Design an enzyme around this catalytic site. Structure first.
Site, PDB file in Angstrom:
ATOM      1  N   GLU A  73       0.005   9.687 -14.713  1.00 55.43           N
ATOM      2  CA  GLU A  73       0.687   8.724 -13.830  1.00 55.43           C
ATOM      3  C   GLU A  73      -0.117   7.468 -13.584  1.00 55.43           C
ATOM      4  O   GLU A  73      -0.487   7.163 -12.436  1.00 55.43           O
ATOM      5  CB  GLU A  73       0.872   9.510 -12.499  1.00 55.43           C
ATOM      6  CG  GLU A  73       1.856   8.976 -11.510  1.00 55.43           C
ATOM      7  CD  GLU A  73       2.085   9.942 -10.353  1.00 55.43           C
ATOM      8  OE1 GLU A  73       3.109  10.657 -10.358  1.00 55.43           O
ATOM      9  OE2 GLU A  73       1.195  10.026  -9.486  1.00 55.43           O
ATOM     10  N   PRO A  74      -0.363   6.682 -14.618  1.00 59.66           N
ATOM     11  CA  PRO A  74      -1.163   5.477 -14.523  1.00 59.66           C
ATOM     12  C   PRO A  74      -0.379   4.342 -13.877  1.00 59.66           C
ATOM     13  O   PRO A  74       0.835   4.285 -14.011  1.00 59.66           O
ATOM     14  CB  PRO A  74      -1.402   5.097 -16.006  1.00 59.66           C
ATOM     15  CG  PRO A  74      -0.124   5.555 -16.667  1.00 59.66           C
ATOM     16  CD  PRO A  74       0.298   6.785 -15.942  1.00 59.66           C
ATOM     17  N   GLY A  75      -1.112   3.475 -13.193  1.00 56.31           N
ATOM     18  CA  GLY A  75      -0.478   2.246 -12.649  1.00 56.31           C
ATOM     19  C   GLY A  75      -1.243   1.074 -13.325  1.00 56.31           C
ATOM     20  O   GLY A  75      -0.873   0.601 -14.379  1.00 56.31           O
ATOM     21  N   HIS A 105      -3.824  13.343  -7.500  1.00 57.33           N
ATOM     22  CA  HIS A 105      -4.182  11.954  -7.748  1.00 57.33           C
ATOM     23  C   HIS A 105      -5.484  11.636  -7.031  1.00 57.33           C
ATOM     24  O   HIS A 105      -5.547  11.581  -5.797  1.00 57.33           O
ATOM     25  CB  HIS A 105      -3.077  10.987  -7.375  1.00 57.33           C
ATOM     26  CG  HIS A 105      -3.502   9.552  -7.506  1.00 57.33           C
ATOM     27  ND1 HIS A 105      -3.622   8.924  -8.716  1.00 57.33           N
ATOM     28  CD2 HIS A 105      -3.997   8.695  -6.565  1.00 57.33           C
ATOM     29  CE1 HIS A 105      -4.146   7.719  -8.535  1.00 57.33           C
ATOM     30  NE2 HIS A 105      -4.310   7.531  -7.231  1.00 57.33           N
ATOM     31  N   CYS A 108      -5.438 -21.124   5.849  1.00 63.83           N
ATOM     32  CA  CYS A 108      -6.272 -21.514   6.980  1.00 63.83           C
ATOM     33  C   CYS A 108      -6.974 -20.292   7.565  1.00 63.83           C
ATOM     34  O   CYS A 108      -6.803 -19.946   8.709  1.00 63.83           O
ATOM     35  CB  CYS A 108      -5.525 -22.316   8.021  1.00 63.83           C
ATOM     36  SG  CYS A 108      -5.925 -24.109   7.937  1.00 63.83           S
ATOM     37  N   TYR A 142     -11.130  -6.221  -1.078  1.00 61.82           N
ATOM     38  CA  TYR A 142     -12.049  -5.246  -1.632  1.00 61.82           C
ATOM     39  C   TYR A 142     -13.312  -5.876  -2.222  1.00 61.82           C
ATOM     40  O   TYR A 142     -14.189  -5.134  -2.675  1.00 61.82           O
ATOM     41  CB  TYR A 142     -11.371  -4.423  -2.727  1.00 61.82           C
ATOM     42  CG  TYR A 142      -9.978  -3.934  -2.474  1.00 61.82           C
ATOM     43  CD1 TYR A 142      -8.900  -4.448  -3.198  1.00 61.82           C
ATOM     44  CD2 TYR A 142      -9.710  -2.920  -1.564  1.00 61.82           C
ATOM     45  CE1 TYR A 142      -7.615  -3.994  -3.001  1.00 61.82           C
ATOM     46  CE2 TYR A 142      -8.427  -2.453  -1.357  1.00 61.82           C
ATOM     47  CZ  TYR A 142      -7.380  -2.992  -2.076  1.00 61.82           C
ATOM     48  OH  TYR A 142      -6.099  -2.533  -1.876  1.00 61.82           O
TER      49      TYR A 142
HETATM   50  C1  LIG Z   1      -6.433 -19.668  12.693  1.00 60.45           C
HETATM   51  C2  LIG Z   1      -6.605 -21.141  13.079  1.00 60.45           C
HETATM   52  C3  LIG Z   1      -6.593 -21.308  14.481  1.00 60.45           C
HETATM   53  C4  LIG Z   1      -6.320 -20.136  15.397  1.00 60.45           C
HETATM   54  O1  LIG Z   1      -7.468 -19.278  15.470  1.00 60.45           O
HETATM   55  P1  LIG Z   1      -7.438 -18.150  16.609  1.00 60.45           P
HETATM   56  O2  LIG Z   1      -8.653 -17.321  16.572  1.00 60.45           O
HETATM   57  O3  LIG Z   1      -6.202 -17.319  16.422  1.00 60.45           O
HETATM   58  O4  LIG Z   1      -7.344 -18.864  17.947  1.00 60.45           O
HETATM   59  C5  LIG Z   1      -6.757 -22.581  15.082  1.00 60.45           C
HETATM   60  N1  LIG Z   1      -6.918 -23.649  14.281  1.00 60.45           N
HETATM   61  C6  LIG Z   1      -6.946 -23.580  12.909  1.00 60.45           C
HETATM   62  C7  LIG Z   1      -7.155 -24.884  12.122  1.00 60.45           C
HETATM   63  C8  LIG Z   1      -6.774 -22.344  12.306  1.00 60.45           C
HETATM   64  O5  LIG Z   1      -6.788 -22.235  11.017  1.00 60.45           O
HETATM   65  C1  LIG Z   2      -1.557   4.325  -6.910  1.00 57.22           C
HETATM   66  C2  LIG Z   2      -1.025   5.700  -7.325  1.00 57.22           C
HETATM   67  C3  LIG Z   2      -1.145   5.897  -8.718  1.00 57.22           C
HETATM   68  C4  LIG Z   2      -1.641   4.785  -9.616  1.00 57.22           C
HETATM   69  O1  LIG Z   2      -3.060   4.622  -9.477  1.00 57.22           O
HETATM   70  P1  LIG Z   2      -3.774   3.680 -10.559  1.00 57.22           P
HETATM   71  O2  LIG Z   2      -5.219   3.571 -10.301  1.00 57.22           O
HETATM   72  O3  LIG Z   2      -3.111   2.334 -10.529  1.00 57.22           O
HETATM   73  O4  LIG Z   2      -3.541   4.306 -11.924  1.00 57.22           O
HETATM   74  C5  LIG Z   2      -0.739   7.104  -9.339  1.00 57.22           C
HETATM   75  N1  LIG Z   2      -0.217   8.074  -8.568  1.00 57.22           N
HETATM   76  C6  LIG Z   2      -0.065   7.972  -7.206  1.00 57.22           C
HETATM   77  C7  LIG Z   2       0.532   9.171  -6.451  1.00 57.22           C
HETATM   78  C8  LIG Z   2      -0.446   6.792  -6.587  1.00 57.22           C
HETATM   79  O5  LIG Z   2      -0.315   6.651  -5.307  1.00 57.22           O
HETATM   80  N1  LIG Z   3      -6.342 -12.837  10.192  1.00 60.41           N
HETATM   81  C1  LIG Z   3      -7.548 -13.024  11.030  1.00 60.41           C
HETATM   82  C2  LIG Z   3      -7.448 -14.309  11.844  1.00 60.41           C
HETATM   83  C3  LIG Z   3      -8.073 -15.542  11.183  1.00 60.41           C
HETATM   84  C4  LIG Z   3      -7.720 -16.815  11.938  1.00 60.41           C
HETATM   85  C5  LIG Z   3      -8.484 -18.028  11.479  1.00 60.41           C
HETATM   86  N2  LIG Z   3      -7.793 -19.284  11.827  1.00 60.41           N
HETATM   87  C6  LIG Z   3      -7.655 -11.832  11.994  1.00 60.41           C
HETATM   88  O1  LIG Z   3      -6.639 -11.109  12.087  1.00 60.41           O
HETATM   89  O2  LIG Z   3      -8.679 -11.619  12.646  1.00 60.41           O
HETATM   90  N1  LIG Z   4      -4.523  -1.727  -4.170  1.00 57.78           N
HETATM   91  C1  LIG Z   4      -5.584  -0.926  -4.821  1.00 57.78           C
HETATM   92  C2  LIG Z   4      -4.979   0.168  -5.693  1.00 57.78           C
HETATM   93  C3  LIG Z   4      -4.792   1.519  -4.996  1.00 57.78           C
HETATM   94  C4  LIG Z   4      -3.968   2.474  -5.848  1.00 57.78           C
HETATM   95  C5  LIG Z   4      -3.940   3.886  -5.329  1.00 57.78           C
HETATM   96  N2  LIG Z   4      -2.775   4.639  -5.830  1.00 57.78           N
HETATM   97  C6  LIG Z   4      -6.421  -1.863  -5.706  1.00 57.78           C
HETATM   98  O1  LIG Z   4      -5.933  -2.993  -5.924  1.00 57.78           O
HETATM   99  O2  LIG Z   4      -7.499  -1.506  -6.185  1.00 57.78           O
END
Ligand SMILES: *Cc1c(COP(=O)(O)O)cnc(C)c1O
Ligand SMILES: *Cc1c(COP(=O)(O)O)cnc(C)c1O
Ligand SMILES: N[C@@H](CCCC[NH3+])C(=O)O
Ligand SMILES: N[C@@H](CCCC[NH3+])C(=O)O
EC number: 4.1.1.20
Lengths: 419, 419
Positions: free
Chosen positions: B267-269, B190, B341, B310
């Site tokens: 093996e498509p997804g 794969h 948030c 991504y």
């Molecule tokens: C995430 C968030 C925080 C907390 O941020 P930290 O870096 O974890 O301290 C505080 N206030 C608001 C409004 C948020 O969304």
């Molecule tokens: C994710 C995965 C697939 C499916 O990949 P697609 O890009 O969605 O087709 C197929 N085989 C294995 C082993 C996988 O982990």
């Molecule tokens: N999920 C982010 C935190 C964002 C918080 C913003 N209020 C991190 O893990 O860094």
């Molecule tokens: N989560 C990835 C797919 C990875 C699949 C690998 N088997 C995407 O959304 O692109």
């Protein structure tokens, strides 16, 4: 991070090795005394309002409340979590604030019903709230025109951020406040400065400027969150007295403008909870791929998302299955990866996706790895990707480990589809 | 993607506008006839084995099975899902294959008990399986020494991938096979080529080379997945006959080497399921941030993770609340973002995090947006970040929409903590 042998805390090598056998693996572990220590460091502020999206378990919320910490909710689910932890808007109206840039129907009904103060981050949301709950008590989250970090990118402030009322839209916010007779409680900013104290002073200065220009009376201001923690060896920890110095000075200028005391909130998430938590995972496969040495464990990006999502660094320690110390063992450059059937499931990677190695003792299947500093945005971000269940959570309080979340089951997820 | 007005399918403007009122919002919607069409395009292959991690709802698995499609499981949860959809290892031993680079204790017990063939991606995993289930029927996933795309980065192949047995480790794999008397059913790769047919031929050529060099008898080979879909206007769709040409040619060389017919799996997804699905979300806040026009909806990165993770492109359409066509309406460069948030909660952003705009009709709160082509890695990747519940799923089959997953509840998530 902390050393598993230096350990004054409960997060020691011996305590962690035994946990998986009792509670299962992988598993999130927290040390209550580390949270209390972080809370104590912010004792100067009038209010410490925990951003529960960093670590929402209701038992950890209960611990916050026990320590006099209030709570910020950003969704209907977080409101229900705050209520389950014993916060109560009927007796204490400011113990829960609902904060977001959007509000939906169910949340509108819940905040109206319980009279939970709303921190509105869009003019539309303020209008929707006001139309169904005239005279509601509100805060205004203001975007001061700038964020932190690369400013082309998704941000907490600036024009490439969805967050908060753009500062030049304030007059329109006031029109909405006046139309529905909303009661302004406070003005809030969440930008995040970490240990960049010059940036922090820009945020403090913007709050003063904007509050004074807006010209409305209010009871409180909030510094928002964004206190950093040193995930890597030798990085600088936040100086809370310095944070207090700068925000108190801003609060004082505002109080002097208004002619009466103004309360000062700080709203940390990460700072309170990150270093208190670890994630224990078992080594399952060890292999050589060309010139890379790979160590695959049973926790993956659905459990701890940070490295895959952001390239976040989390310190990694190894624990021999038989318990012998690996403290002084020789290390091999290791790539650590998960069980998911997805290429991005690698814990040792940089922002952007580049694979990198970590100097680690040479473990075998059966041994464990500990991911440090996963108390914040660890369990809270978890997903069910690859049909994998939410993990169990364990809380240490003075040497005693207790289950605060049982492992989710595949049956519970299938129940959603067996209609 | 498809047009909501051109629509031959059930995914029309009128059908989608009504769904949120009946089933709630936001909500995942799938068109069963689009999945059947994708399945038909791969009718040349002996076996189409759906990678259920792309879209795991058991009703959609049932539809696959109905069409003669088999299923790949990558976790214990996916095994249970396959069994709930009616696949049955007792009567049909190859209808479920368990595929991964790691195997845990519970999965070992389940695959041994039901005699589900295992596709091992690490020598350690093959040894663990063999020790508890001597003579088990297995596949070998081989890493041929190269992946696809930037090769420094986390990959499906090459040395910066955790996936599959490195091709030079095959002799050690054979030793393990021999030690536990494992029964080799097939050899699998794969890597994923999309529409890069020259890369695909390298994968085909590597499979021939490696299978022949390994010198073991087997019953089948697998091409793995990685068929792309055109998310953006004018991109090229996969030519399945071309995929079949190249893999059948590889299968034939192998069959000639072995002196007997060799089955060919694909093996498509994504290919089977991506274009069948949409995500409907309501506009809640519309605002100007400096020079950016922001439209915030009620679905966020916890629901559809791709753009945040991504930089994935998903086509976006707007649906007026009152139902008037916005087909020819004027457009405004719009940034579309969620309710979370968290700064990264923006659907219109590039790989790397840069915010970008999308030409869209000028919607208001109450209107809806449709995110196209979310059938693959949409609901399957969802998380509960910000204490937000798994969304409902709806399946269209010839004009009739039916609930195939009810909305998860906050009570069900709190039940894990109320011990
Ligand atoms: C995430 C968030 C925080 C907390 O941020 P930290 O870096 O974890 O301290 C505080 N206030 C608001 C409004 C948020 O969304
Ligand atoms: C994710 C995965 C697939 C499916 O990949 P697609 O890009 O969605 O087709 C197929 N085989 C294995 C082993 C996988 O982990
Ligand atoms: N999920 C982010 C935190 C964002 C918080 C913003 N209020 C991190 O893990 O860094
Ligand atoms: N989560 C990835 C797919 C990875 C699949 C690998 N088997 C995407 O959304 O692109």
């Amino acid at each position: 991070p902390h050393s598993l042998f230096s350990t004054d805390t409960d997060l020691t090598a011996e305590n962690l090795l035994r946990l998986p056998a009792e509670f299962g693996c992988p598993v999130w572990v927290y040390d209550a005394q580390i949270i209390r220590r972080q809370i104590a460091a912010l004792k100067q502020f009038d209010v410490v309002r925990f951003a529960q999206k960093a670590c929402s378990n209701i038992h950890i919320l209960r611990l916050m409340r026990e320590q006099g910490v209030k709570v910020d909710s950003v969704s209907l689910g977080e409101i229900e979590r705050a209520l389950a932890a014993g916060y109560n808007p009927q007796t204490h109206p400011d113990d829960i604030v609902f904060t977001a840039d959007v509000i939906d129907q169910a949340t509108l009904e819940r905040v109206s019903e319980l009279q939970i103060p709303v921190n509105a981050g869009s003019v539309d949301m303020l209008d929707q709230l006001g139309q169904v709950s005239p005279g509601h008590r509100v805060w205004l989250r203001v975007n001061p025109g700038f964020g932190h970090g690369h400013s082309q990118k998704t941000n907490t402030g600036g024009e490439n951020s969805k967050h908060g009322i753009w500062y030049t839209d304030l007059p329109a916010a006031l029109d909405v406040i006046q139309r529905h007779h909303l009661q302004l409680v406070g003005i809030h900013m969440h930008i995040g400065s970490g240990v960049d104290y010059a940036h922090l002073e820009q945020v403090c200065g913007a709050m003063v400027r904007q509050v004074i220009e807006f010209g409305q009376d209010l009871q409180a201001i909030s510094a928002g969150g964004g206190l950093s923690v040193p995930y890597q060896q030798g990085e600088e920890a936040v100086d809370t007295e310095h944070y207090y110095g700068l925000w108190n000075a801003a609060r004082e200028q505002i109080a002097r403008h208004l002619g009466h005391p103004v309360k000062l909130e700080i709203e940390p998430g990460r700072f309170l909870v990150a270093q208190s938590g670890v994630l224990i995972t078992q080594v399952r496969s060890v292999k050589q791929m060309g010139s890379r040495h790979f160590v695959l464990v049973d926790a993956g990006f659905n459990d701890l998302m940070r490295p895959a999502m952001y390239g976040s660094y989390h310190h990694i320690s190894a624990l021999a299955a038989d318990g012998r110390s690996l403290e002084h063992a020789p290390t091999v450059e290791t790539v650590v990866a998960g069980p998911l059937c997805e290429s991005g499931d690698v814990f040792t990677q940089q922002e952007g996706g580049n694979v990198e190695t970590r100097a680690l003792p040479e473990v075998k299947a059966g041994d464990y790895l500990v991911l440090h500093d996963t108390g914040a945005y660890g369990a809270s971000m978890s997903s069910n990707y690859n049909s994998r269940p939410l993990l169990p959570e364990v809380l240490f309080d003075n040497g005693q480990a207790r289950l605060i979340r049982r492992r989710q089951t595949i049956e519970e997820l299938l129940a959603l589809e067996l209609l």
